Amino acid sequence: LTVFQCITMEGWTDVLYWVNDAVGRDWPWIYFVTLIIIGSFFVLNLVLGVLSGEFSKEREKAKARGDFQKLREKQQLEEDLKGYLDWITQAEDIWNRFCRRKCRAAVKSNVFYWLVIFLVFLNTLTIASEHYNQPNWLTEVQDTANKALLALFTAEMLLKMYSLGLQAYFVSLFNRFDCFVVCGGILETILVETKIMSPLGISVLRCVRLLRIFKITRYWNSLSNLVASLLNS
Amino acid sequence: EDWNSVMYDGIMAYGGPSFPGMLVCIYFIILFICGNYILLNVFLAIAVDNLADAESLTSAQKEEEEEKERKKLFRLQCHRIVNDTIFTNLILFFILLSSISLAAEDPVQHTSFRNHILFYFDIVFTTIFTLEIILKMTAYGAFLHKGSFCRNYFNILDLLVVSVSLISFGIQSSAINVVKILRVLRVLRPLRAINRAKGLKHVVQCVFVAIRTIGNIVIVTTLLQFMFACIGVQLFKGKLYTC
Amino acid sequence: TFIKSFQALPYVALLIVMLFFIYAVIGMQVFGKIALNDTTEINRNNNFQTFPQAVLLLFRCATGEAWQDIMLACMPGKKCAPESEPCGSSFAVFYFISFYMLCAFLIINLFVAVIMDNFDYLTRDWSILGPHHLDEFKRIWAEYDPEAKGRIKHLDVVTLLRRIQPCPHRVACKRLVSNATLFALVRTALRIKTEGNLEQANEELRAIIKKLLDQVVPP
Amino acid sequence: DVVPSMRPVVLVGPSLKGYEVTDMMQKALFDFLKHRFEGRISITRVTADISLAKRLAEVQSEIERIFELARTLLVVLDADTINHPAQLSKTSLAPIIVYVKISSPKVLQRLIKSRGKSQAKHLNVQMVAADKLAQCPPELFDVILDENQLEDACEHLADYLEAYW
Amino acid sequence: WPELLYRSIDSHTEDKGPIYNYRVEISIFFIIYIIIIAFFMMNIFVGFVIVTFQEQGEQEYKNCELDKNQRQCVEYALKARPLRRYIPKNQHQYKVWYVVNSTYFEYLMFVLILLNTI
Ligand SMILES: COc1ccc2cc1Oc1ccc(cc1)C[C@H]1c3cc(c(OC)cc3CCN1C)Oc1c(OC)c(OC)cc3c1[C@H](C2)N(C)C=C3
Ligand SMILES: [Ca+2]
Ligand SMILES: [Ca+2]
């Protein structure tokens, strides 16, 4: 039992200090130090190896099951719709609606992309600047800053709703996510305005606002495949 | 975490340590051994099978549908560079002995009978390694000759450590608190051996390349961990005090 | 295989050694003069005073054993050592956090490096013939033949120890007809091809794969 | 035979021209051609049949007026009669025919369902036309419209239009 | 962890002392955090290194050649060396040599050592 506790590495040091106080400090460490390295690390390395090695068998076996092939089908499939749905929008515009061309042109423009990124950067400061006893003015700054950022984020969200096809906007997974958070922010304004908030409400309603930080890491594809593969499984 | 505290509470519940009681350890050993085996399978299978598919897309779709979208289509004379072979192993000895020199200094004894003895060993090593600083002048570099010295930053580190030791003696006469930190930075001696050991250079270089690839993962965790901290602050913004 | 692999990757294990030494020295000095006392983590049995003691504390924090409690012990404002003739540091928060991250990462690199360099055995279906089969073939041959006394000397089927895993349908007799024997089984145990030209095709493979004596390879 | 001083440009779309879904796919495409080939390109819109050409009464004058524009010294011809390279193989006017493709037919249903439910049930009448367009080898399959977006798909038309001009 | 968990559960209100098990629902926050970062994300990083190293390892994939089983096997072509056996020549030596080399002797000793530890 005493040996087994050491290998789990909890209480490992306490017994060592109860032995150093009985037979001196010189030799005893070799028993426990070698026990952890030989007992814990190697087996922890072995167990990791076989588990990692074994799953290569199933992963190789799963290749014949076409899990990647089916997954690849959805990825290319759903990607095309967004590309093809662009044509219809680019053609639906050949009551004057020539301004709709201008609004779309900004959506894909670099200036618009970084503008929202900066807004997301500000939103982090609004929330990250919490403090146990904030100055009485800081709460007002966070109060106004939260509201102002909420209007801009929804204001540009609606822009994409009209600039891009309503059905087209919901095609992309990320675009679906943005509606979820921005919709959640609206509840906060109503709940805070009407004084019907609950301790449960503020937590998640705060959490959604933080999730807007995921606006960052959009170009990056390493994480995109993780989530895409993750959702399939 | 406190796997022990729970066990001993369980054992004492069934009397003291004896034969009839004390067998409840079987429940805790079963729980930990069987419990931790499930977590490895569930989370390694999730993190390997799904991860393997994700990178497969990153290398299958990205590689080929971009192959197709692109398939759309001073004195320079009588210098002595000799003796660089024996010094190869010899220098590694001084670094090894120099590191041990600072591994033996006693911190607690301000007026130590040993630090003064060690202080001399720093002199000999400091003087010895300053010789190679002069030697490097003969070789291409010295911020000159197309910056041969600046093209190998690993060799620059050799100078910085020597300069750090040299600076310490100058400020030692002043007997000022500044030297308190300068001494700490001298610990960089062992890394000096990296530039000289061919087999070690590959390992340390391989570590950096890994970090560059990992950058796509650690960056995600930092945002995720920071996201939890932001939630954490709201939940417990100073409610944890206790008289 | 694992013990063998650790030998093939010594320099990686040296890197983790350098991490302990570098951090042990830094901790040895900045937190050298902390006041020892019971009821606190920095006590008679834990302290950055002697190098062996410091490295053990670094090892202690490596396995995550109340390391966070030590981090609070080295924070500034702690009484100083009686030897000193107000004595801690605030570098601890970075010191222990940085060590655990770096130590945890290098151990990960050390663990995975051994796994991958030994990935052949770990992922092996154990159905196709492997090196183990050759070794047990040597032992029976060795028991069937002492030191360097066998060239052909084959007139009996006592070498029947081969089970289903590489006289059913007389294939053994045909295989037997087709170190000399050792190469014979491998070229036919996997059954690379059956076209009446494997030797000619394989005779052109060992030429490019290779070096050593080739007057026994053709057989 | 003899070049009619021009290489008329026509577009079959991914399916029957009788519906709106195919129509929008090209109106945007046509626009970019005339904004980057000022004068070089000309556009013609007709509603009669061209298959019955002898190298119905209205079709008699259809070829000449197309030729009349072709005499002015590309020309884009828009018609609802061509649904397969065979329809234009009956005459040798050196036409250039461009094909819109949906590599996976599964995309069509999502696209068709989006515009309106009235024509959603007509996917069978439409998806079939796409299949008919998936049997012509390169020879009757000259122009390649495979990429989804426009900016990187339209440019694949201009480069093919530099063969002579 | 548990010391903080039970100091967080006993959290009444901002700037106020603790109340025993005021809100045990808060444990969801720690359990969710433990699973996500400590267990899940930590495994992704471990899995990523294993896969990333595999790309480096398979740099010399050489798809043209056949499986790696041949690589070991052909490299084993230099095998089949003499192995020390030294069958006894003296009749007296052979008697003891057979029994000690007997499978019974190997199994018999394993019983003794097991008893020795007992
Ligand atoms: C300083 O280096 C280390 C110090 C301490 C430790 C490991 C160290 O190195 C590693 C080696 C291998 C890996 C990660 C780290 C990878 C390994 C692993 C190991 C691992 C994980 O928990 C977080 C998670 C993972 C992810 C999956 N794969 C399989 O270790 C565990 C436990 O898992 C069995 C555990 O039970 C759940 C409890 C503890 C620990 C560690 C041990 N400590 C901190 C505390 C308790
Ligand atoms: Ca613990
Ligand atoms: Ca622990």
Side-chain angles (χ1 to χ4, degrees):
Chain A
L1 188 65
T2 285
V3 163
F4 185 76
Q5 289 172 190
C6 308
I7 297 169
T8 68
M9 294 182 286
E10 294 294 328
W12 156 72
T13 191
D14 304 332
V15 65
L16 172 63
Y17 296 156
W18 294 326
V19 170
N20 274 341
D21 305 353
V23 297
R25 278 186 301 178
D26 186 74
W27 48 284
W29 62 269
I30 193 161
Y31 171 84
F32 291 102
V33 162
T34 311
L35 169 56
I36 292 300
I37 292 169
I38 294 293
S40 176
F41 280 12
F42 285 3
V43 305
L44 177 50
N45 174 21
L46 291 185
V47 67
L48 189 151
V50 299
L51 263 73
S52 179
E54 181 145 79
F55 289 168
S56 167
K57 307 300 207 331
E58 314 319 319
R59 267 199 293 93
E60 189 274 329
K61 264 185 199 68
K63 188 90 203 182
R65 275 79 193 174
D67 265 352
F68 169 84
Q69 289 77 334
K70 293 202 202 64
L71 165 58
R72 180 182 39 67
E73 186 175 1
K74 268 173 48 157
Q75 207 59 87
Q76 66 89 35
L77 183 63
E78 295 290 14
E79 190 277 331
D80 291 331
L81 282 72
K82 312 197 310 308
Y84 281 156
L85 278 152
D86 211 359
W87 291 353
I88 294 89
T89 303
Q90 291 205 47
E92 188 264 5
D93 59 350
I94 66 167
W95 47 98
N96 51 354
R97 298 292 183 273
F98 85 109
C99 199
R100 313 315 314 211
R101 299 161 192 173
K102 275 184 186 177
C103 76
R104 276 180 280 275
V107 176
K108 60 215 80 176
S109 58
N110 283 319
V111 62
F112 182 76
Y113 157 75
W114 289 99
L115 172 43
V116 62
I117 282 283
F118 177 82
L119 268 75
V120 175
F121 185 80
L122 270 190
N123 200 259
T124 301
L125 260 62
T126 286
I127 288 150
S129 74
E130 284 297 335
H131 182 74
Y132 158 60
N133 56 6
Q134 301 162 355
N136 57 1
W137 58 266
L138 182 54
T139 301
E140 294 293 328
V141 176
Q142 285 188 356
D143 188 358
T144 59
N146 180 5
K147 289 193 194 309
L149 266 289
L150 185 64
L152 294 174
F153 268 121
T154 187
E156 70 86 19
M157 199 280 266
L158 273 295
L159 183 142
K160 291 177 185 176
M161 291 325 268
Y162 292 165
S163 284
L164 273 284
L166 191 83
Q167 311 297 353
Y169 184 109
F170 281 22
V171 176
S172 184
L173 198 75
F174 197 58
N175 288 121
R176 287 145 46 124
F177 162 80
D178 268 326
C179 187
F180 182 76
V181 65
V182 75
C183 196
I186 307 304
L187 283 72
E188 181 273 335
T189 312
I190 304 308
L191 266 65
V192 75
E193 172 165 318
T194 303
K195 195 70 171 174
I196 50 171
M197 191 95 88
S198 312
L200 160 59
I202 187 166
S203 179
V204 303
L205 293 174
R206 286 298 115 184
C207 173
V208 295
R209 300 166 37 63
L210 281 294
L211 281 172
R212 207 176 293 150
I213 287 148
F214 278 20
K215 276 308 311 195
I216 309 163
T217 72
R218 214 195 174 282
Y219 280 174
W220 292 353
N221 54 4
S222 179
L223 161 68
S224 79
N225 294 134
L226 294 174
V227 172
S229 188
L230 184 64
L231 264 295
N232 188 359
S233 176
Chain B
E1 199 284 336
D2 268 324
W3 181 65
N4 288 277
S5 306
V6 188
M7 181 155 38
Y8 301 136
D9 300 339
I11 287 165
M12 301 285 328
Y14 282 57
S18 305
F19 194 10
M22 211 275 288
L23 286 169
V24 300
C25 303
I26 300 302
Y27 164 62
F28 288 100
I29 282 161
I30 287 166
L31 167 55
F32 184 95
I33 291 300
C34 182
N36 276 126
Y37 164 77
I38 276 169
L39 271 73
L40 299 201
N41 289 337
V42 63
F43 284 120
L44 207 75
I46 286 166
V48 165
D49 201 321
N50 298 5
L51 173 73
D53 277 358
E55 63 85 20
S56 185
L57 277 77
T58 301
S59 161
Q61 295 299 107
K62 315 307 211 204
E63 184 70 26
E64 293 177 350
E65 314 306 291
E66 270 315 292
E67 183 178 2
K68 293 179 179 179
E69 183 178 2
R70 293 182 183 174
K71 183 178 179 180
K72 293 179 179 179
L73 295 174
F74 53 89
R75 182 177 182 272
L76 305 171
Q77 63 185 2
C78 204
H79 59 77
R80 288 279 78 202
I81 310 302
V82 66
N83 285 315
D84 279 21
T85 56
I86 187 166
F87 273 22
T88 304
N89 270 7
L90 204 63
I91 290 289
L92 293 197
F93 188 103
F94 308 120
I95 297 169
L96 188 153
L97 186 62
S98 66
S99 68
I100 288 165
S101 295
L102 58 82
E105 278 206 330
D106 182 72
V108 66
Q109 295 297 109
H110 68 308
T111 47
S112 177
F113 207 73
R114 216 190 309 148
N115 298 341
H116 212 82
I117 299 164
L118 277 296
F119 182 76
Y120 289 10
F121 283 90
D122 186 74
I123 297 286
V124 55
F125 293 151
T126 299
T127 57
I128 285 162
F129 262 69
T130 312
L131 295 174
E132 293 75 0
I133 305 300
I134 294 169
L135 186 142
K136 180 61 176 65
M137 161 198 200
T138 69
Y140 304 120
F143 282 84
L144 305 149
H145 299 88
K146 198 60 176 174
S148 290
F149 184 68
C150 75
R151 283 225 60 74
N152 207 6
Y153 268 32
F154 303 91
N155 224 335
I156 294 174
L157 182 161
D158 195 313
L159 185 64
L160 189 147
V161 59
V162 174
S163 309
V164 164
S165 77
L166 195 86
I167 295 155
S168 49
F169 291 115
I171 316 304
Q172 190 67 284
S173 52
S174 294
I176 195 66
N177 57 358
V178 178
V179 76
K180 76 202 277 282
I181 301 299
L182 179 64
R183 178 155 307 291
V184 176
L185 188 153
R186 92 182 189 139
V187 69
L188 201 63
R189 290 154 142 65
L191 282 72
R192 186 155 58 253
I194 297 169
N195 190 11
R196 306 273 296 183
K198 189 54 49 163
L200 184 53
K201 262 180 67 58
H202 170 227
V203 171
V204 69
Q205 258 181 342
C206 189
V207 164
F208 280 111
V209 168
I211 297 169
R212 159 168 306 146
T213 59
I214 295 303
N216 273 312
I217 297 297
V218 175
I219 196 74
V220 176
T221 298
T222 293
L223 301 199
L224 193 51
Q225 179 149 59
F226 173 85
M227 183 278 288
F228 270 117
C230 279
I231 285 164
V233 162
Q234 272 141 12
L235 278 173
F236 319 90
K237 196 173 58 142
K239 310 174 163 64
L240 297 191
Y241 281 101
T242 180
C243 182
Chain C
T1 59
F2 268 95
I3 301 299
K4 179 50 66 180
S5 294
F6 279 106
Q7 159 59 2
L9 278 297
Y11 273 108
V12 190
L14 189 151
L15 184 60
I16 178 56
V17 164
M18 273 164 41
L19 200 168
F20 271 98
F21 183 96
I22 290 288
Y23 271 73
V25 164
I26 295 163
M28 184 180 288
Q29 294 170 353
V30 302
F31 321 117
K33 305 174 194 67
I34 309 302
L36 308 180
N37 60 351
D38 299 332
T39 81
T40 299
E41 299 304 339
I42 298 290
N43 63 354
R44 306 161 293 99
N45 303 321
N46 260 348
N47 44 8
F48 294 80
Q49 279 188 350
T50 61
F51 189 86
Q53 283 161 257
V55 169
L56 184 67
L57 196 152
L58 270 293
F59 184 63
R60 182 184 189 275
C61 292
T63 56
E65 172 75 20
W67 69 271
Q68 48 80 22
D69 272 325
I70 287 172
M71 182 179 72
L72 277 296
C74 313
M75 291 309 219
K78 310 277 177 255
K79 188 168 76 70
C80 198
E83 172 58 30
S84 64
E85 193 267 330
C87 183
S89 159
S90 178
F91 178 68
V93 73
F94 172 87
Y95 176 77
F96 290 115
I97 299 286
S98 173
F99 171 68
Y100 195 82
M101 294 209 189
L102 274 182
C103 184
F105 171 54
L106 296 203
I107 295 303
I108 283 294
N109 168 280
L110 169 53
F111 282 10
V112 174
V114 160
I115 296 306
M116 295 299 291
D117 186 74
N118 193 68
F119 202 59
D120 186 74
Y121 167 58
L122 265 61
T123 186
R124 178 145 67 81
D125 61 355
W126 270 108
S127 301
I128 300 165
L129 73 165
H132 60 290
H133 284 140
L134 294 174
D135 188 0
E136 57 83 18
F137 204 51
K138 184 73 179 66
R139 274 288 275 269
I140 184 65
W141 181 65
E143 197 268 328
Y144 187 77
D145 168 64
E147 299 97 337
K149 196 167 71 68
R151 284 311 321 201
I152 300 100
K153 72 169 182 65
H154 202 56
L155 302 169
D156 49 339
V157 66
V158 174
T159 61
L160 78 165
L161 179 58
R162 176 263 167 182
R163 296 306 181 187
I164 185 62
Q165 47 262 22
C167 303
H169 294 90
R170 184 151 191 241
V171 302
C173 200
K174 306 161 201 178
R175 288 178 64 220
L176 164 57
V177 164
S178 62
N179 191 34
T181 57
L182 188 148
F183 178 71
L185 293 79
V186 55
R187 63 175 283 288
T188 308
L190 190 142
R191 293 286 219 180
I192 305 166
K193 295 180 88 75
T194 66
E195 67 285 25
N197 210 36
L198 195 147
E199 198 211 14
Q200 179 268 333
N202 204 335
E203 274 160 1
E204 300 216 345
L205 283 173
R206 297 294 302 276
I208 62 165
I209 296 306
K210 83 197 182 188
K211 289 282 173 63
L212 270 291
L213 312 187
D214 283 304
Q215 92 296 15
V216 180
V217 159
Chain D
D1 189 2
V2 56
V3 65
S5 162
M6 271 295 158
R7 274 98 61 72
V9 176
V10 293
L11 182 62
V12 305
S15 61
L16 306 173
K17 273 61 65 181
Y19 297 67
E20 65 277 21
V21 61
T22 291
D23 213 358
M24 283 74 74
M25 300 284 218
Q26 65 183 357
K27 314 322 320 183
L29 185 50
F30 294 171
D31 296 4
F32 293 99
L33 277 296
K34 71 222 187 198
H35 313 316
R36 80 209 195 218
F37 293 100
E38 291 315 346
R40 187 71 65 79
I41 198 66
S42 64
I43 298 169
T44 312
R45 171 64 202 190
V46 297
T47 51
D49 295 335
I50 304 297
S51 59
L52 271 43
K54 302 287 103 177
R55 194 162 174 79
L56 190 146
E58 311 95 347
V59 177
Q60 292 178 351
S61 68
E62 281 305 9
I63 187 66
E64 293 82 3
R65 68 180 65 252
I66 297 169
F67 266 69
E68 171 57 280
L69 277 296
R71 294 272 82 77
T72 69
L73 272 164
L74 279 298
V75 63
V76 186
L77 176 55
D78 189 358
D80 314 332
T81 313
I82 62 170
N83 288 359
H84 202 296
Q87 284 79 81
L88 267 165
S89 73
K90 188 167 173 68
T91 179
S92 194
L93 320 173
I96 178 64
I97 298 89
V98 294
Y99 293 10
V100 170
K101 291 188 287 294
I102 320 298
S103 286
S104 181
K106 180 66 222 70
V107 173
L108 271 295
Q109 303 64 20
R110 314 231 60 181
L111 269 288
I112 292 161
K113 197 65 154 154
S114 43
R115 291 309 311 199
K117 314 212 191 273
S118 63
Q119 68 280 356
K121 278 66 64 173
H122 292 171
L123 77 164
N124 47 14
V125 181
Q126 198 72 275
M127 68 91 72
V128 293
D131 200 346
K132 314 202 201 153
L133 298 169
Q135 278 96 61
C136 47
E139 311 325 328
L140 309 97
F141 182 76
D142 45 359
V143 185
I144 298 314
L145 311 193
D146 49 358
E147 203 276 340
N148 46 354
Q149 284 76 241
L150 192 150
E151 295 278 10
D152 48 356
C154 65
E155 52 86 10
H156 187 77
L157 276 78
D159 58 7
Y160 184 100
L161 292 195
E162 311 316 280
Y164 192 87
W165 290 318
Chain E
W1 172 58
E3 52 164 79
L4 191 54
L5 170 50
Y6 298 118
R7 269 287 277 280
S8 66
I9 281 161
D10 291 331
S11 70
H12 172 230
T13 309
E14 184 148 358
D15 177 76
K16 277 200 183 304
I19 310 177
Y20 186 98
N21 271 346
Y22 173 59
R23 47 182 198 177
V24 65
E25 63 190 2
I26 301 299
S27 179
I28 289 166
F29 167 45
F30 282 89
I31 298 295
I32 291 292
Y33 175 72
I34 287 281
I35 285 165
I36 296 285
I37 299 297
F39 278 135
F40 167 54
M41 293 292 317
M42 181 75 217
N43 264 267
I44 295 286
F45 165 81
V46 173
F48 202 60
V49 176
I50 281 154
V51 165
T52 300
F53 276 36
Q54 194 162 2
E55 190 277 331
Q56 288 184 5
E58 65 90 21
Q59 58 196 129
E60 59 189 356
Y61 191 69
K62 292 192 278 265
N63 65 359
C64 312
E65 72 186 1
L66 310 175
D67 64 355
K68 62 183 75 64
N69 300 295
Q70 83 190 358
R71 300 289 84 201
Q72 296 174 5
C73 286
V74 302
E75 286 304 321
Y76 297 166
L78 307 172
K79 205 212 171 293
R81 292 180 180 90
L83 283 182
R84 306 160 187 262
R85 275 181 72 201
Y86 182 76
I87 303 300
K89 61 187 76 175
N90 180 15
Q91 46 160 331
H92 311 93
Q93 294 183 358
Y94 192 94
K95 274 208 80 60
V96 296
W97 177 91
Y98 176 58
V99 59
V100 301
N101 197 6
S102 79
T103 183
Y104 297 163
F105 186 79
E106 297 145 78
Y107 283 30
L108 183 63
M109 296 273 297
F110 291 2
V111 176
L112 266 291
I113 182 151
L114 272 184
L115 265 289
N116 186 41
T117 63
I118 287 162

